[PDB]
Design a protein around this ligand. Structure first.
Ligand code: NA
Ligand code: NA
Lengths: 382, 388
């Protein structure tokens, strides 16, 4: 329910029933042999798991310190770690007798991931998306329609992600009998933060096993970018108990901390209730965020990261638009891997951290996705 | 050098030393322990091999006939099988003491794959590309420059693939001391058709093991799309001695075979010489390579590998055509039905597999090589199909 004081289930009574039903359904299937046989089989044959753990040899020699490994989630079907979550939540919903999936999206990336999972399982999929987001993300919207999903633009208020979230809550409230709300990150009321993190944990369990095979030891640092925080928890969570591993989350520094134009909820937001959870967001009411990485452009952050920060298990830092962009070009030229701009934040801070560390130390960076979707954006910038 | 009567080494005398040195190095390293260790390590950690074999249940049942499995080359780093070849050849060139990679590309996908490999190995990369093809493929070209590669537009001839290949050939002739010419399909002068096939054979080796594991027997048919024939030879080759295994190569039918606007070299082409090989080519009454059309840019290659010409002669493999209309429907169909957006080249294979399974019985099996992912083609498909 909670992670320290963070988390919770602060929703209108109308949503309490649907949430307990989700929580009970999850408790039953989570460890179920048959449900896990279906999920591991989709992740293998359909999604491509396991993803490799890659030694960035040339980048490492260039900077001069720590060995840099990349967890290559960029190679997941769809090009983004979000697939892991969406393909876990979709079959679950079908086991509860749901014929429909809804979800909201800002950058369009969870939109794509959900439409894909829906196509696979033959469920209807409706995606809420602010009309201003729709215009900015022409290609993700087309991807969604290609996969057979309906994209409902929201043409009220600020016409942004905040307006789309609310419209999806009102929808689910009306249609939970047959509809599952497929939340995209480790946010929202219990049990979503836990469910999402459990479905992304596969990343860390593989990474863990892959670095023991390659180096004979656990890593010294694990770096990962943080929007809501699903890829970060995914890779962090199997190492939470291992005291020797530093966990570093990298939030979107945007145009700089002092400009207002960033998405550093943990580093600069205040605690509050939002989206049915107690955590950090930028604010009284939500204030707008910004990031060149569209997936990091979300006012809030996960309550389990809020917790890890409070108890100091994990450290959180920022990287600017300019820093991520240079790391986008760096990894491309030096390793032949074009990273998602979200992932480039992690890479950019890994590059800074490596410089100050010893040649015998080890950083693993969660390369949360590939850069193909971001080519237009980088072309306007450069 | 030969596959029956096709293949050969039809290049100026200047290129014969370079091609002997390449053949000598390949025979030295092909079975070398360390070379294969490093190659397999890259193919695993950098490219993401193995790729899974995926059962498309929903599609199979909708059609109501033979089983359809997709070999998921769309998941390889880069989005396409091409990477398998590029990461085979680039280290080989380095071990030969070369510091520069050059390459032809028409769709831009091979040039991207070449750029990625050169970036990894820290080699210079020059990509020759038809000026008309540069204009039609702005994101693949941006990808190449992002990767550190220089792109060199070709304004000679019809400014298409054919001309890029010749300019590539002319450059290598001058610079072969330091430059390896990274040929991107099972084409070119010997030893390239053999080499490229050998580096794509991994696909069929994985598929053979995976289908045995999944079904307890070999496939009844295997379907791959054919431009130059790289991905098809890759999946075909480890099954060629398995006599019962049908092999089907699907070529671009374009607007229709009777329209001339297509790219079906094996079905409608004549025997000729181009690119330093003897194989099948699309040409007119006066011998010149005719322009090739397909909605799938990677099947614009105006000829085909000599080994496919050989397999067609001895009727080991069958070769068919599929139209733009048909491939485009398969692209939509696979996206809705399996949530996998295929490359338009691969959608040719799927389209044929969908036609073939319907006629076959429910206990027969078809492996389709899903050669690439469709992200690169979305601008094309939105223009063709429309903004829904
Ligand atoms: Na945030
Ligand atoms: Na052809």
């Amino acid at each position: 329910m909670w992670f320290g004081e963070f988390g919770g289930q602060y929703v209108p009574e109308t949503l309490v029933g649907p949430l307990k039903e989700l929580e009970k359904a999850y408790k039953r299937f989570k460890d179920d042999e048959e449900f896990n046989r279906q999920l591991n089989y989709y992740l293998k044959t359909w999604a491509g798991r396991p993803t490799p753990l890659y030694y960035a040899k040339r980048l490492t020699e260039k900077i001069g310190g720590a060995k840099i490994y990349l967890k290559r989630e960029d190679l997941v079907h769809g090009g983004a770690h979000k697939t892991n979550n969406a393909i876990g939540q979709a079959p679950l919903a079908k086991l509860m007798g749901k014929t429909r999936l809804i979800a909201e999206t800002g950058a369009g990336q969870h939109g794509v991931a959900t439409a894909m999972a829906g196509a696979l399982l033959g469920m209807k999929v409706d995606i809420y998306m602010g009309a201003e987001d729709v215009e900015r993300q022409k290609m993700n919207v087309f991807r969604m329609k290609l996969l057979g999903a309906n994209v409902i633009p929201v043409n009220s208020g600020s016409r942004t992600a905040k307006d789309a979230i609310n419209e999806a809550l009102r929808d689910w409230e009306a249609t939970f009998e047959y509809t599952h709300y497929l939340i995209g990150s480790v946010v929202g009321p219990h049990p979503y933060p836990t469910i999402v993190r459990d479905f992304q944990s596969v990343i860390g369990r593989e990474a863990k096993a892959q670095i023991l095979e390659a180096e004979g030891q656990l890593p010294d640092v694990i770096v990962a970018c943080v929007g809501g925080g699903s890829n970060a928890m995914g890779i962090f969570y199997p190492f939470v108990n291992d005291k020797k591993v530093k966990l570093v989350g990298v939030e979107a520094g945007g145009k700089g901390l002092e400009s207002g134009k960033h998405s550093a909820s943990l580093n600069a937001g205040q605690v509050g209730v939002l989206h049915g959870m107690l955590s950090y967001f930028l604010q009284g009411q939500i204030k707008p965020s910004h990031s060149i990485a569209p997936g990091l452009d979300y006012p809030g952050v996960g309550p389990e990261h809020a917790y890890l920060k409070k108890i100091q298990r994990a450290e959180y830092v920022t990287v600017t638009d300019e820093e991520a962009l240079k790391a986008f070009h760096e990894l491309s030229r030096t390793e032949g891997i074009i990273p998602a701009l979200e992932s480039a934040h992690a890479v950019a801070y890994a590059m800074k951290l490596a410089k100050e560390m010893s040649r015998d130390e080890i950083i693993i960076v969660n390369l949360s996705g590939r850069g193909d979707k971001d080519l237009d954006i980088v072309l306007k910038a450069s």
